Design goal:
Chain C: This is Replication factor C subunit 2. Chain C: GO terms for molecular function: ATP binding; ATP hydrolysis activity; DNA binding. Chain C: Belongs to the activator 1 small subunits family. The structure is cut from a larger assembly and holds chains A, B, C and D. By secondary structure, chain B is an alpha+beta fold. Helix content of chain B is about 20%, strand content about 40%. In chain B, β8 and β9 form a beta hairpin. The longest helix of chain B is centred in the middle third of the chain and has 13 residues. The radius of gyration of chain B is 21 Å and the shape is elongated. In chain C, α12 packs across α13. The longest helix of chain C has 19 residues. The N and C termini of chain C lie far apart (about 60 Å). In chain D, α11 crosses α13. The longest helix of chain D is centred in the C-terminal third of the chain and has 19 residues. The chains are: A alpha/beta, B alpha+beta, C alpha/beta, D alpha/beta. Chains in contact: A-B, A-C, A-D, B-C, B-D, C-D. At the C-D interface, α2, α5, α8, α9 and β5 of C face α1, α9, α10, α12 and α14 of D. Bound molecules: phosphothiophosphoric acid-adenylate ester (3 copies) and magnesium ion (3 copies). The site of one magnesium ion has 2 residues of chain C, from α3.
Chain lengths: ~325, ~290, ~325, ~325
Amino acid sequence: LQLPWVEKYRPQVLSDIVGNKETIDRLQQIAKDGNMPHMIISGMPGIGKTTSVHCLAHELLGRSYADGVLELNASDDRGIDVVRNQIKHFAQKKLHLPPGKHKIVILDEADSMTAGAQQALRRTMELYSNSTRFAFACNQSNKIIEPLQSRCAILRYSKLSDEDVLKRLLQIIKLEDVKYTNDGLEAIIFTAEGDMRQAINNLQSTVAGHGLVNADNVFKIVDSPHPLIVKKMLLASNLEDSIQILRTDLWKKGYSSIDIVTTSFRVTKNLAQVKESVRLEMIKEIGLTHMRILEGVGTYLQLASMLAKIHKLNN
Amino acid sequence: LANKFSASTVHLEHITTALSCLTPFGSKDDVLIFIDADGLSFVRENNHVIKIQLLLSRELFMSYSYRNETEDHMKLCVKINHILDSVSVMNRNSDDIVECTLSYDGHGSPFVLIFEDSFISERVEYSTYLIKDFDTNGLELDRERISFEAIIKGEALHSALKDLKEIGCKECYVYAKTEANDENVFALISKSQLGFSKIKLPSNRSILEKLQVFDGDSTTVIDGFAVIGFFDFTSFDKIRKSTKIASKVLFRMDVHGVLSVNILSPGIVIEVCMLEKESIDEAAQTEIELLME
Amino acid sequence: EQSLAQQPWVEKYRPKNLDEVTAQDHAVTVLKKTLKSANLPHMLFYGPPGTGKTSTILALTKELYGPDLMKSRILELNASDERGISIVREKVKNFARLTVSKPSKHDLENYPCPPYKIIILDEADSMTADAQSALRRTMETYSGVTRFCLICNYVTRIIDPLASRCSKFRFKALDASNAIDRLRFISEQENVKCDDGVLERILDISAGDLRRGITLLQSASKGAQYLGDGKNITSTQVEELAGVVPHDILIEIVEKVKSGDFDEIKKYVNTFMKSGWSAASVVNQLHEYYITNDNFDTNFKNQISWLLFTTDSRLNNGTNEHIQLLNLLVKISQL
Amino acid sequence: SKENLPWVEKYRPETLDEVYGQNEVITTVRKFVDEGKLPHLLFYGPPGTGKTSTIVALAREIYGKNYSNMVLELNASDDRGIDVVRNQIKDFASTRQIFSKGFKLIILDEADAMTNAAQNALRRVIERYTKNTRFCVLANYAHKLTPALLSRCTRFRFQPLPQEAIERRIANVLVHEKLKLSPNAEKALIELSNGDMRRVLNVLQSCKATLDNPDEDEISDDVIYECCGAPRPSDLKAVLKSILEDDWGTAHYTLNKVRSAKGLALIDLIEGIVKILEDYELQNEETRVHLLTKLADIEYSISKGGNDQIQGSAVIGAIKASFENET
Ligand SMILES: Nc1ncnc2c1ncn2[C@@H]1O[C@H](COP(=O)(O)OP(=O)(O)OP(O)(O)=S)[C@@H](O)[C@H]1O
Ligand SMILES: Nc1ncnc2c1ncn2[C@@H]1O[C@H](COP(=O)(O)OP(=O)(O)OP(O)(O)=S)[C@@H](O)[C@H]1O
Ligand SMILES: Nc1ncnc2c1ncn2[C@@H]1O[C@H](COP(=O)(O)OP(=O)(O)OP(O)(O)=S)[C@@H](O)[C@H]1O
Ligand SMILES: [Mg+2]
Ligand SMILES: [Mg+2]
Ligand SMILES: [Mg+2]
């Protein structure tokens, strides 16, 4: 069959990863040099952490990749016994590698690892660092215990810029010979919200549905991120405007009340314009409405009353 | 009897053996019972990837009556745990039980099992359940596209399975190759904590009765071509208990990635069908080639 | 005769068949014709206390199957049973998947015997959200052999997917207009002699709950029988039994509120709480007195309505009666 | 067999052509299957919009009538803990097709009920076995899905059912049955449906029951209101007019009479009055604030029980006080 473009066009070399130019350049330097230290790679979903670690391991180990890499993720058994036996035996293995090259243990989604396993990892890292190096990949670097962080170089991946997403989208379009327009690519990038995976999925969906990637065609399938709609609803200077946004853009589109209130809390946490007193009062009202929704009264009237209270506070 | 199906026997070994063979498929799940003039079959499936069917023919029962006319067969579903617990409690005095009778009166009635002793009879009725939409016939060997066939002695295969289990085997690879001068190579290659290990079956007509590679069409024999099947040991090991009583085992692998094991112990016959993994990693392929060459 | 007199009147006169259910014809008609259509959907009965939900479902189950078949075709679970997520995923699912039992010749001759079972989840509003979520596809998948009946007082406690799955039946409140015939029949059966309008008063006091009305009638009948004077029961006796505050006490409270003196109101309330009156009844009586009075203006009535609503809502949360009553009276005196 | 089924199940769409209202999603998924490039799918929407029906119909179209042999369906009624993901889903996704019938399909219905650990374990299972397997996740509440899972799925939103699709399905049902529906009854049914087909079908079945002779009796709006026990628009209009114009005694009497005529519940009256007032043109916005806050408080209080008469009087007083601002 035909693979989805998200997996079909997964970068296979470090030079095809867009964004985080400084970090990717440093990874390329490490690959060409060899002296890879223990590292932690943190960042939001779909920005290239897994791809970056895999590409770096491949470039470092060459043909020895099969015998020199041990990959484990949240879908595998990773308990304390695994650390005691499998990882320990891999780190004990004597493998002849070119100078400056070490075995690599990739621990994808390391944040989910249990406390006992993480504590056990300390001793193996202490003992087998001369021949083995650890690459953790996670979304929250703080979920790795401090004794493990103390041994690793930290690398934080930032959200991808519109320029990098556009460049990769153009490369994919050229490879696939896809017909498009500037407004269509703008809409895809705007709906991706910095997630390259979502951008590729939306591009593929639009192409399959209609082929030509225009703004109207993109917005027929893809929806604008509802956090922005919630921000617009909260920032409306008129009660009727907020109510109209809540009705037309969220309620009648099938968005659940619980999702609306959770997104409202998340957005209100990041409103830079408002004062602290107003912000905390809005948070209180959102929390009370959330309590009411959890009890079973998830009605449009409750959300309208929440908006009315927020507007009252703004005055 | 007035029941639509009624079969009575004096050999309690067959029933307990069948339950023992069905146990590895899960102590708490469903079992399908098929009833027809030919006999009575127990069927179990796991994870839409493995299936076992154990048949009890008419000859095994001293009495067998199938009076249904509208339908040539009857299908029902029961819970394995219920039967297991009931038999375990009832079979405590195995020396005294003299007769065992199974009965069924069609859809809407329970599956009745009676243990008849010299003066005491114990009757149990198992409630039946709707049969899942999944079709047992879905997982079957394509008889027209056999990649290879082999006949093996039960004892040797059972010993090999025991060895694989005792080393904590995680992945299994069935390797089958044929050459001239009646040279045959059937082997099981295991990936485990020990690394890669091999168990080779001798090329003698005492344990490996025959081996043939058909080039994926069941007809043309090809020499020098190796057929490799990659399986998860979790599913492969489920035939160990069936091999324990097995007298002969017939392996048949098709091109669609289906392996069928027919176990022969008048007698109890078993058929286990399993699917293989999608593909073999480069490291595993290299290690297998190095082990076999 | 002693054995028949071993049951309280509410259990004694629980409807036996669907014909005995009163004032709920809008749903009873559908349920009754289901006996011939054999097209019973999943049901969600919801309504206030003592309106006839449990009785209706029990009568339906009796009518559909009969005394013998019912035992094999009904699974009943209520708040007295453990109903965690594991229970929903194992026991309820296993029953829903069970093969439909074969009816006997007598059952087929005497009852329709539809080819499906029934799972009754009484007091469904007590189940957790996750446990409720575990029911969705179980109800959808096995609808060919199983039908579910959920019963509750607070429909908002049922998650939206389950409410969408179930056909909804609202049970109306039973008042003096729609439930008087049943109470009159019960009184006639027990030879209760009451003055004209007594049953009306009982039904108005009960406020939609026929169970409470029947219990009140039984208590009044017991009092009259113990007295043994042969005289008719009076509305005053019914009000005394129901815990209604006498009109003179309410008049005194109203006069104190009108006076406006905080200390006098506090003293009177302290003495009034001695008698153990339930604050809910007092608040209801005060609402009736003030809202219907023509001596007060519109702004006063709006303010007092909101005050009464706030006090009643606070009381519903199991708050402390003396404090709430005193606060309400002080607020009213300040209007 | 199908005749004994409840209408919500008897009229479940079998093919994608029977799914109405979701034209964009159906179009896109049909073209994807036509080209055989199905990606990992997320179906997000409110109850009774066609998500489960659509996914089952798509599976039927892909695998014909033998879809039950190569589709792994799991829902909230099944345990789906991290162990289940690690063993059962992993083994199904990592094994060959029954007869090399392209890729396999795993349906995770009501996936918002899955634990965070299981969802985290699902990420690499989805990613690694994409060549051989495709995942479908159905949900009503997106906030229960981890960001990593959301990033991996192509998202499709099922909107509340438009009026036209509901009318078409109602016509189909009326033809299938021997039933006659009046235009006013159809309008009332659409209004009360709120975009959920299940409610439409359940109310239609109850209405058919209500008819003495369904072969010739036609369903009117009165039958719909009787079956649902809901207030009529005239009742709501009269109550609101009395509240906004009549004095307190008259308004109280009007509310009591309207409720007692057909045993109407206060919550439905409040909801209808709120619908009516949402379209009101108010020159003072503070009136809207008071109305919304007070009525939401009354609804929340009613949700817990309480005194019905006090709640009704509270509704009257709240509306009056709020509209004193417009003065
Ligand atoms: N910087 C990038 N450049 C090119 N493609 C990218 C990039 N980031 C993500 N993608 C694309 O999206 C797919 C997934 O990328 P990943 O490396 O798995 O993202 P991720 O940050 O590891 O997501 P998580 O943390 O596992 S949820 C890749 O196969 C690429 O096709
Ligand atoms: N519609 C009714 N018709 C006749 N008697 C009724 C009716 N409703 C209640 N009763 C009487 O009150 C008793 C209790 O009725 P139930 O059916 O238990 O009410 P209920 O709605 O189930 O109460 P809840 O919701 O559990 S507090 C019955 O045994 C009858 O004696
Ligand atoms: N688009 C639709 N077209 C026709 N009938 C529908 C449609 N959506 C729902 N229905 C009807 O309502 C019933 C339920 O449809 P479902 O597909 O199960 O809705 P749903 O969106 O999956 O509900 P949830 O999210 O699991 S509560 C179907 O059997 C149909 O009879
Ligand atoms: Mg990753
Ligand atoms: Mg009850
Ligand atoms: Mg669904």
